[PDB]
Design a binder for these strands. Structure first.
Ligand SMILES: [Mg+2]
Ligand SMILES: [Mg+2]
Ligand SMILES: [Mg+2]
Ligand SMILES: [Mg+2]
Ligand SMILES: [Mg+2]
Ligand SMILES: [Mg+2]
Ligand SMILES: [Mg+2]
Ligand SMILES: [Mg+2]
Ligand SMILES: [Mg+2]
Ligand SMILES: [Mg+2]
Ligand SMILES: [Mg+2]
Ligand SMILES: [Mg+2]
Ligand SMILES: [Mg+2]
Ligand SMILES: [Mg+2]
Ligand SMILES: [Mg+2]
Ligand SMILES: [Mg+2]
Ligand SMILES: [Mg+2]
Ligand SMILES: [Mg+2]
Ligand SMILES: [Mg+2]
Ligand SMILES: [Mg+2]
Ligand SMILES: [Mg+2]
Ligand SMILES: [Mg+2]
Ligand SMILES: [Mg+2]
Ligand SMILES: [Mg+2]
Ligand SMILES: [Mg+2]
Ligand SMILES: [Mg+2]
Ligand SMILES: [Mg+2]
Ligand SMILES: [Mg+2]
Ligand SMILES: [Mg+2]
Ligand SMILES: [Mg+2]
Ligand SMILES: [Mg+2]
Ligand SMILES: [Mg+2]
Ligand SMILES: [Mg+2]
Ligand SMILES: [Mg+2]
Ligand SMILES: [Mg+2]
Ligand SMILES: [Mg+2]
Ligand SMILES: [Mg+2]
Ligand SMILES: [Mg+2]
Ligand SMILES: [Mg+2]
Ligand SMILES: [Mg+2]
Ligand SMILES: [Mg+2]
Ligand SMILES: [Mg+2]
Ligand SMILES: [Mg+2]
Ligand SMILES: [Mg+2]
Ligand SMILES: [Mg+2]
Ligand SMILES: [Mg+2]
Ligand SMILES: [Mg+2]
Ligand SMILES: [Mg+2]
Ligand SMILES: [Mg+2]
Ligand SMILES: [Mg+2]
Ligand SMILES: [Mg+2]
Ligand SMILES: [Mg+2]
Ligand SMILES: [Mg+2]
Ligand SMILES: [Mg+2]
Ligand SMILES: [Mg+2]
Ligand SMILES: [Mg+2]
Ligand SMILES: [Mg+2]
Ligand SMILES: [Mg+2]
Ligand SMILES: [Mg+2]
Ligand SMILES: [Mg+2]
Ligand SMILES: [Mg+2]
Ligand SMILES: [Mg+2]
Ligand SMILES: [Mg+2]
Ligand SMILES: [Mg+2]
Ligand SMILES: [Mg+2]
Ligand SMILES: [Mg+2]
Ligand SMILES: [Mg+2]
Lengths: 100, 88, 68, 275, 114
RNA sequence: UGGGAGAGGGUGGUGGAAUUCCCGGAGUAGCGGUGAAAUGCGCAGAUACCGGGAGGAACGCCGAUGGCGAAGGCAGCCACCUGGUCCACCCGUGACGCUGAGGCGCGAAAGCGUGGGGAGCAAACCGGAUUAGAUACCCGGGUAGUCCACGCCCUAAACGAUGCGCGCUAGGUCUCUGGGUCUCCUGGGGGCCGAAGCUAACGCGUUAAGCGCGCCGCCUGGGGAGUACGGCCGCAAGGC
């Protein structure tokens, strides 16, 4: 097991119930791939720096998780399988590096 | 990778006295463990020639240690290489 | 005026900190140099990578145009 | 991984044969084979209408499931990967948990023991059939229906694949094995992944007799014939074509396009092929 | 007809082409160092770019064009002269923005540019 | 044992800029190009502008006088797998070391084979100019190739033109990266300037080209010639 921060960005122009069906898919995906979800920070719609898929906004999910190191690629790829999942970034979690 | 737990089993199953961490046996054993993990990794990643240099350096290192233990103890040499299934 | 001064204590890896990180990009979207950033050698590499990530997550621009 | 031979005959020199590594069962499912009528290129009139055919190895035809919307939602187990002399792809025997058994053409990377399923809700997984409108854009796909419920017409030979490029209304945009870009209805089924046995094009027949085994009788050059036979016939000694290169029947055979202009599918061919 | 629009200055070391668009970027009219009888090296001079800009605005203002946001591309010597000309034409130059294409180290340049 | 830095390597994925092309819009008399031109392209609607699409390659800023690697070489970003290396504690083994003819493996670019891919670029090639000529430089085109996979080739100004290891002989200064008690002290790299000394001089100078020891490789006037013959390797080119 290792700790990863799974970033996901969704389709903003979705009702919260389509948005619910997508999170449930994600949920079952993290579930069936071995992740144990610690924290979960869901910032929602957010103004984009540049247009993504013709959309200046996205719905930003974030999951601190703990999964077997040898399946995070397959999981991440599986998150991308959906068309409303416009971005996914799984990162290795690190203790912070600070200034001041 | 090798984790601290598997690495200690190797030291445990090869220490001479349950505190020893640097004898020829525990070194040959520790190298043999790096090699096979690497030797297998190279069998999949055939173009990782840089890591292969690492493989040769550990092989030479173990061979020099095995050359030393055969001088000081042909009996314990033979005992070590069999427990690691090494000769070829 | 350097950015490490113009900001209190921050985490050089929170790639989600747009308010902290955007302060490290010129008016034209480029990663500022240490002569503007004020970070050290080792700090500058960390900042840029986490800037680079936030660009991929759409949190920071890769480039903005120049206004007069 | 095509196999070579040491040069212990003239022909063994260059001959190559498939490795058949992935084949797991070597006699066909008796319930799914019927006799394949060798034509020799002859039609119902008895006439040769395709020259240089015949005399090849006897074959049983394996019935292949080109629909698969036949059995929506019914999971199936890949039980065997078999040889099939009637196509370039290998074939896979599916034991549907239904108890029903069917052959599909075998996609690359398909593993005996895995499960496949057909339907709108099938996971985007190699071997699964879905209507085109539900496969993600960018996905590589094969055994594609050309028209809804008419059956898999596209990307069926060893190695081929169509790629899903975009959607427009009821239609999807496919890059066919030829590189042609074409509109195909979203209801048309396709199976995720490329056809397997992609090494099939690297086989070297190696001797004349191997073409005979395949039913391919020897081709005779027009230039080798006489003028009653062929445009290129005749001449004292050898002879260049001496006219635009023609078929036996007179039509030009270097670049002369032959697709019909007013064909209805033109409204669906986006861009002609490549290379 | 439209009142406000955008003014685009494509300007290389060869020429300076001004096209005035509408708010939607659809061109209202255009001009360049060729629309004023210069052919050749002269098409790339500052004066050429001035007349090109003046012929651009005088053609667009003749469509009711009053306000332009000035988008500037290239680096040719007729660049600054074009912006100056647009503020002197009579147009309500509401902006100047440099949108020169710059790759993030992409396609290999011609030998002339390596 | 516990830590740290890193474009070290391999695999899968993935982001934005940009160019080319296609489509739709809108729009008109040119564009492009050079020293100046022409070729080219453009009323068959180009260029310039917007929107959409495809595909390829390369990763701007960070970025450095930087880092890593044995060398060649390595630069978006993410994960996986893997190497080397450095530091601390001074815990374990007890000289187990150094080098290294052969051997083996690695080895820029180009080139070669079988597939694939092909946006840009561009040997060849064509055209335009220049010129006495111009099989060049400059311009417009342009096929290999550049890219991927696998297999070959094994070359180089493969350079620090400086083999490897150890020990010893002032410091000043800048920097990367560890440790400390964090002024500063100490390691390990990267440069600079310089003591003694070396050097034909230029220069070198704790990153020796100084003082020593070990081992290896190599030189013995220029041309002929890295050619011939032989032999080995290679598909060939050609290498040794
Ligand atoms: Mg998606
Ligand atoms: Mg963090
Ligand atoms: Mg053979
Ligand atoms: Mg033989
Ligand atoms: Mg042989
Ligand atoms: Mg097979
Ligand atoms: Mg029967
Ligand atoms: Mg029949
Ligand atoms: Mg009949
Ligand atoms: Mg009859
Ligand atoms: Mg009859
Ligand atoms: Mg026929
Ligand atoms: Mg026939
Ligand atoms: Mg067939
Ligand atoms: Mg078959
Ligand atoms: Mg159709
Ligand atoms: Mg073929
Ligand atoms: Mg046959
Ligand atoms: Mg034939
Ligand atoms: Mg013939
Ligand atoms: Mg004859
Ligand atoms: Mg007859
Ligand atoms: Mg006749
Ligand atoms: Mg005739
Ligand atoms: Mg004839
Ligand atoms: Mg004849
Ligand atoms: Mg004849
Ligand atoms: Mg003759
Ligand atoms: Mg004859
Ligand atoms: Mg001829
Ligand atoms: Mg003739
Ligand atoms: Mg003819
Ligand atoms: Mg076609
Ligand atoms: Mg000009
Ligand atoms: Mg450690
Ligand atoms: Mg158009
Ligand atoms: Mg013309
Ligand atoms: Mg007209
Ligand atoms: Mg014209
Ligand atoms: Mg393409
Ligand atoms: Mg001690
Ligand atoms: Mg002792
Ligand atoms: Mg090489
Ligand atoms: Mg090469
Ligand atoms: Mg090639
Ligand atoms: Mg070109
Ligand atoms: Mg000419
Ligand atoms: Mg010429
Ligand atoms: Mg002449
Ligand atoms: Mg040229
Ligand atoms: Mg080409
Ligand atoms: Mg290769
Ligand atoms: Mg150099
Ligand atoms: Mg040399
Ligand atoms: Mg040496
Ligand atoms: Mg170094
Ligand atoms: Mg130092
Ligand atoms: Mg002196
Ligand atoms: Mg001396
Ligand atoms: Mg002197
Ligand atoms: Mg001097
Ligand atoms: Mg010096
Ligand atoms: Mg010093
Ligand atoms: Mg000589
Ligand atoms: Mg020779
Ligand atoms: Mg040579
Ligand atoms: Mg010879």
């Amino acid at each position: 097991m290792r700790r990863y921060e799974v970033n996901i960005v969704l389709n903003p122009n979705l009702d919260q119930s389509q948005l619910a069906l997508e999170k449930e898919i994600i949920q079952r995906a993290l579930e069936n791939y071995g992740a144990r979800v610690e924290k979960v920070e869901e910032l929602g719609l957010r103004r984009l720096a540049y247009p993504i898929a013709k959309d200046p906004q996205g719905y930003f999910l974030w999951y601190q998780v703990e999964m077997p190191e040898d399946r995070v690629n397959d999981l991440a790829r599986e998150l991308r399988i959906r068309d409303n999942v416009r971005r996914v970034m799984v990162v290795k979690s690190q203790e912070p590096f600070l200034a001041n | 990778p090798i984790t601290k737990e598997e690495k200690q089993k190797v030291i445990q199953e090869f220490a001479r006295f349950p505190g020893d961490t640097g004898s020829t046996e525990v070194q040959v054993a520790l190298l043999t463990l790096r090699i096979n993990r690497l030797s297998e990794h190279l069998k999949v990643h055939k173009k990782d020639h840089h890591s292969h240099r690492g493989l040769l350096m550990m092989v030479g290192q173990r061979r020099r240690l095995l050359r030393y233990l055969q001088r000081e103890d042909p009996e314990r040499y033979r005992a070590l290489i069999e427990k690691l299934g090494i000769r070829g | 005026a350097k950015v490490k001064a113009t900001l209190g204590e921050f985490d050089l890896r929170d790639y989600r900190n747009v308010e902290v990180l955007k302060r490290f990009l010129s008016e034209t979207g480029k990663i500022l140099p240490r002569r503007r950033t004020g970070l050290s050698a080792k700090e500058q590499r960390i900042l840029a990578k986490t800037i680079k990530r936030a660009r991929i997550l759409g949190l920071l621009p890769f480039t903005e145009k120049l206004v007069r | 991984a095509v196999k070579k031979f040491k040069p212990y005959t003239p022909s063994r020199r260059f001959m190559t044969v498939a490795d058949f590594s992935e084949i797991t069962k070597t006699e066909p499912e008796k319930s799914l084979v019927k006799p394949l009528k060798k034509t020799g290129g002859r039609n119902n009139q008895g006439r040769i209408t395709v020259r240089f055919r015949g005399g090849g190895h006897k074959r049983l035809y394996r019935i292949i499931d080109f629909k698969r919307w036949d059995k929506v939602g019914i999971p199936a187990k890949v039980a065997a990967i078999e040889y099939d002399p009637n196509r370039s792809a290998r074939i896979a025997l599916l034991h549907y948990v239904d108890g029903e058994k069917r052959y599909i053409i075998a996609p690359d990377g398909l593993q005996v023991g895995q499960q496949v399923v057909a339907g709108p809700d099938a996971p985007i997984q190699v071997g699964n059939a879905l209507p085109l409108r539900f496969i993600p854009v960018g996905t590589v796909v094969h055994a594609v229906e050309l028209e809804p419920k008419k059956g898999a017409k596209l990307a069926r030979a060893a190695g081929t694949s169509a790629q899903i490029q975009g959607r427009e209304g009821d239609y999807v945009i496919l890059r066919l094995p030829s590189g042609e870009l074409r509109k195909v209805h979203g209801e048309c089924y396709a199976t995720v992944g490329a056809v397997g046995n992609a090494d099939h094009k690297n086989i070297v027949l190696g001797k004349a007799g191997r073409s005979r085994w395949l039913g391919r009788r020897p081709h005779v050059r027009g230039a080798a014939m006489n003028p009653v036979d062929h445009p290129h016939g005749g001449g004292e000694g050898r002879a260049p074509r001496g006219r635009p290169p023609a078929s036996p029947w007179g039509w030009q055979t270097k670049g002369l396009k032959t697709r019909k202009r007013r064909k209805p599918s033109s409204r669906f061919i986006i861009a002609r092929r490549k290379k | 007809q439209v009142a406000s629009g955008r003014a685009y200055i494509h300007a290389s070391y060869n020429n300076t082409i001004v096209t005035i668009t509408d708010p939607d970027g659809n061109p209202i009219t255009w001009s360049s160092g060729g629309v004023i009888g210069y052919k050749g090296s002269r098409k790339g001079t500052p004066y050429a770019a001035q007349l090109a800009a003046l012929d651009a605005a005088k053609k667009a203002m003749a469509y009711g064009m009053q306000s332009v946001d000035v988008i500037v591309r290239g680096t040719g010597a007729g660049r600054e002269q074009a912006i100056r000309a647009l503020q002197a034409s009579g147009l309500q130059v509401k902006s100047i923005v440099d949108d020169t294409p710059v790759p993030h180290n992409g396609c290999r340049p011609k030998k002339k540019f390596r």
